[PDB]
Amino acid sequence: KRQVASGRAYIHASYNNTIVTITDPDGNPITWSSGGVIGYKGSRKGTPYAAQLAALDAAKKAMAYGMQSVDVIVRGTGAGREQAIRALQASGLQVKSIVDDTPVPHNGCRPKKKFRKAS
Amino acid sequence: ARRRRAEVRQLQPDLVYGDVLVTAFINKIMRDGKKNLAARIFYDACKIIQEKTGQEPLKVFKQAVENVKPRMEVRSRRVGGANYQVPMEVSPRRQQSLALRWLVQAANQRPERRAAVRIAHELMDAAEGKGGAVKKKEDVERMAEANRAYAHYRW
Amino acid sequence: PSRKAKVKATLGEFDLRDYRNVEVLKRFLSETGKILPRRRTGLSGKEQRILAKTIKRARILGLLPFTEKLVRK
RNA sequence: GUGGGAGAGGGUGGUGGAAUUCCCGGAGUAGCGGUGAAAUGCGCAGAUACCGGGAGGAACGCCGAUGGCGAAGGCAGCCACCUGGUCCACCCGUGACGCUGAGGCGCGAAAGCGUGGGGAGCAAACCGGAUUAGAUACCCGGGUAGUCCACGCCCUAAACGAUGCGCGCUAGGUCUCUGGGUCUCCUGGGGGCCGAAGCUAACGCGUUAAGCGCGCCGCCUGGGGAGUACGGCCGCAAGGCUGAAACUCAAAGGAAUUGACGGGGGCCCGCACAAGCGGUGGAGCAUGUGGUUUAAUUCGAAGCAACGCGAAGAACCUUAC
Ligand SMILES: [K+]
Ligand SMILES: [K+]
Ligand SMILES: [K+]
Ligand SMILES: [K+]
Ligand SMILES: [K+]
Ligand SMILES: [K+]
Ligand SMILES: [K+]
Ligand SMILES: [K+]
Ligand SMILES: [K+]
Ligand SMILES: [K+]
Ligand SMILES: [K+]
Ligand SMILES: [K+]
Ligand SMILES: [Mg+2]
Ligand SMILES: [Mg+2]
Ligand SMILES: [Mg+2]
Ligand SMILES: [Mg+2]
Ligand SMILES: [Mg+2]
Ligand SMILES: [Mg+2]
Ligand SMILES: [Mg+2]
Ligand SMILES: [Mg+2]
Ligand SMILES: [Mg+2]
Ligand SMILES: [Mg+2]
Ligand SMILES: [Mg+2]
Ligand SMILES: [Mg+2]
Ligand SMILES: [Mg+2]
Ligand SMILES: [Mg+2]
Ligand SMILES: [Mg+2]
Ligand SMILES: [Mg+2]
Ligand SMILES: [Mg+2]
Ligand SMILES: [Mg+2]
Ligand SMILES: [Mg+2]
Ligand SMILES: [Mg+2]
Ligand SMILES: [Mg+2]
Ligand SMILES: [Mg+2]
Ligand SMILES: [Mg+2]
Ligand SMILES: [Mg+2]
Ligand SMILES: [Mg+2]
Ligand SMILES: [Mg+2]
Ligand SMILES: [Mg+2]
Ligand SMILES: [Mg+2]
Ligand SMILES: [Mg+2]
Ligand SMILES: [Mg+2]
Ligand SMILES: [Mg+2]
Ligand SMILES: [Mg+2]
Ligand SMILES: [Mg+2]
Ligand SMILES: [Mg+2]
Ligand SMILES: [Mg+2]
Ligand SMILES: [Mg+2]
Ligand SMILES: [Mg+2]
Ligand SMILES: [Mg+2]
Ligand SMILES: [Mg+2]
Ligand SMILES: [Mg+2]
Ligand SMILES: [Mg+2]
Ligand SMILES: [Mg+2]
Ligand SMILES: [Mg+2]
Ligand SMILES: [Mg+2]
Ligand SMILES: [Mg+2]
Ligand SMILES: [Mg+2]
Ligand SMILES: [Mg+2]
Ligand SMILES: [Mg+2]
Ligand SMILES: [Mg+2]
Ligand SMILES: [Mg+2]
Ligand SMILES: [Mg+2]
Ligand SMILES: [Mg+2]
Ligand SMILES: [Mg+2]
């Protein structure tokens, strides 16, 4: 508890999981969730469904700090990224805005052999 | 059905309630094409729904069929690695086909010693939210929704 | 087909080599701080090649962004 | 020569932002990660996700191309310096000063070698986790050389357009990069595409020739043995260049054709699957068969397409044993 009322909601989508982090206006985490926090284990953490659940778990836990509106900040490309956006919108929390800030290098480190034929 | 879309069959309405749905149920109760014996059964049982209920049998019948209709069911679908039980809406027609098939099935699982009694009691018990059929309908519905994680395999 | 309106049309005279004209160079970047294609700039091989270089000079001068986060989504 | 032009051509120094990793601080809590599914792994000594600060290495997103530069290998953030090639215009100067080029000399991707430095990410070997019949692999988690810089070696390649260099000649159309002009268009240099004639085994090539011709260099002479052996030369080494023989084969081979095939694509059918209703597989028995047994158990039928099949009538007969 501290009472924030307005903050940030970071979505980190991956082809392996989705994990939501909610922070204060300065980017300090208040609460967080993920397909793992919810009961999911292996490959299902990446499911769009799980993302929904993780997103809702996050919102609710954020209501406890008495938060109402947030700025969604999406990072990554992964099955279940948009469900998280929707999950948040439909959860009391007011979504003042969505913004994609997935990091991309201006070609820096050689990728793993799995993600090559790129740089 | 590779070429066409397979149109549905039409059935002569009931020789009593003049209802098609009734005939459908009659046919599911049928066996070895003994439609006469089949018809009797539904009727006797249809009577037994009264003098046990002040209500009309048809209203009872039609509402049992209703509570047994599944709104979601899980179907298979291989997606490299194994088969994922995918949940999904059940078409208006399969609901009916399933509902009736299930009633006759649960009915015949009952202990009541004679047919008409069994269909009768299953009809009734179903009408108020209980009985073999409704159980099935709920195990199915529970199956779907229990696999929400594979909902994105729409189809 | 991108039939919006070539950035060259919606504009007039300007020194493609002026790395300080923020108000005009700014126009050749996308929602993101990315240099727009000839498709959108409407410029030409030679013109674009000179634009690309002047824009990059502006970036190192802090008058222009290298990248900017996308709004909406 | 004079005047213009375009360019990731080369060398040296400087420098910018994104990202990864690590370290520090904050905030926050039970997982993160990873796969077909998992596990190894990492995390309560607090990880992952989020914000702020710092260090370091390597590589330059968009622009970016079907583009450009170079003799090739190759060259891509931005700035300055040093430096190569090249194209156009003007017809200004020299006056055949030319082409080619054995040997020589230089350059020459990657890997690799030596010395010293650096080391973020990646990753031979290697250590583990899965997978499999096995799995000294494919997939996952780690990880040393190396990948980076300097200096010195190595000198290879599908070092490819699989097409040596130069010059003249032989329809056009179309796109494009860069220059000049009376700037719908013309004219020069380069990059593509379609094509005249012609060439080609065919495929295809076709003013960017694989056409028609001249000059000079390099190279080929069936396949295996073999790019091996020997010798010589070169290298620190790895190994490079030159490069055989005995023996042996009736072929090896190029292009195109019709098929068949594909764990290639597209379109489409069938009780093919699915949907569904009844059943076989278990029992008893009937019948055919395998097997075994017998003096004989007559013969045939064999996955689908043999097995209540020839047998629409085996007590003798039929009947072949
Ligand atoms: K090119
Ligand atoms: K070694
Ligand atoms: K190098
Ligand atoms: K060298
Ligand atoms: K011009
Ligand atoms: K021909
Ligand atoms: K061809
Ligand atoms: K030798
Ligand atoms: K030696
Ligand atoms: K060598
Ligand atoms: K096919
Ligand atoms: K069948
Ligand atoms: Mg996962
Ligand atoms: Mg000049
Ligand atoms: Mg250059
Ligand atoms: Mg950084
Ligand atoms: Mg910390
Ligand atoms: Mg702390
Ligand atoms: Mg542990
Ligand atoms: Mg503790
Ligand atoms: Mg610790
Ligand atoms: Mg981290
Ligand atoms: Mg940080
Ligand atoms: Mg370090
Ligand atoms: Mg060239
Ligand atoms: Mg090349
Ligand atoms: Mg020059
Ligand atoms: Mg003269
Ligand atoms: Mg003279
Ligand atoms: Mg070399
Ligand atoms: Mg090297
Ligand atoms: Mg070394
Ligand atoms: Mg070293
Ligand atoms: Mg060291
Ligand atoms: Mg690694
Ligand atoms: Mg094993
Ligand atoms: Mg590995
Ligand atoms: Mg090539
Ligand atoms: Mg001509
Ligand atoms: Mg042309
Ligand atoms: Mg040309
Ligand atoms: Mg041209
Ligand atoms: Mg080209
Ligand atoms: Mg011809
Ligand atoms: Mg031919
Ligand atoms: Mg051609
Ligand atoms: Mg010629
Ligand atoms: Mg030779
Ligand atoms: Mg020979
Ligand atoms: Mg021979
Ligand atoms: Mg030979
Ligand atoms: Mg060799
Ligand atoms: Mg030596
Ligand atoms: Mg061939
Ligand atoms: Mg059909
Ligand atoms: Mg049929
Ligand atoms: Mg079926
Ligand atoms: Mg069945
Ligand atoms: Mg049996
Ligand atoms: Mg016999
Ligand atoms: Mg026998
Ligand atoms: Mg015979
Ligand atoms: Mg026989
Ligand atoms: Mg038969
Ligand atoms: Mg006999």
Cβ proximity of C11 and C47 under 8 Å:
no
Residue type at B61 in one-letter notation: F
Rounded Cα gap, residues A83 and A7, in angstroms = 20
Q: Please name which of A55, A7, A44 lies closest in space to residue A28, comparing C-alpha atoms.
A: A7
Residues 6 or more apart in contact with residue B33 via CB below 8 angstroms: none
The first and second tokens of residue C49, run together, are: 């090649």
Instruction: Note whether A96 contacts C: Cβ–Cβ < 8 A.
Output: no
Per CATH, the homologous superfamily of domain A1-119 is Ribosomal protein S11/S14 (3.30.420.80)
Instruction: Tell me if there are at least 3 CB pairs under 8 Å linking chains C and B.
Output: no
- Expressed as residue numbers, the domain containing C62 is 1-73
Biggest alpha carbon–alpha carbon distance for chain A: 48
Nominal resolution in Å?
2.5
- Expressed as residue numbers, the domain containing B16 is 1-155
Residues of B in contact with A40 (CB under 8 A): 149
| Protein-proximal positions, strand D, CB < 7 A | 6-8, 15-20, 26-39, 48-52, 57-65, 67, 77-79, 120-124, 139-141, 176-179, 268-274, 276-278
Q: Residue B29 sits in a domain of what CATH number?
A: 1.10.455.10
Cβ-defined contact of C69 to A98 (cutoff 8 Å): no
The total number of residues written for chain B in this structure = 155
Give the β-pairing of A94-100 and C70-71: antiparallel
**Torsion angles phi and psi, residue C58, rounded to 5:** -60, -40
Q: Residue C16 sits in a domain of what CATH number?
A: 4.10.640.10
The total number of structural domains that make up chain C: 1
Q: Is B32 exposed, middle or buried (0-12, 13-18, 19+ CB in 10 A)?
A: exposed
Residues 7-46 of C with CB under 7 A from strand D: 30, 32-38, 44-46
Residue type at A55 in one-letter notation: A
Rounded Cα gap, residues A65 and A1, in angstroms = 5
CA B143 / C1′ D291 distance in Å: 51
The total number of structural domains that make up chain B: 1
Rounded Cα gap, residues C73 and C71, in angstroms = 7
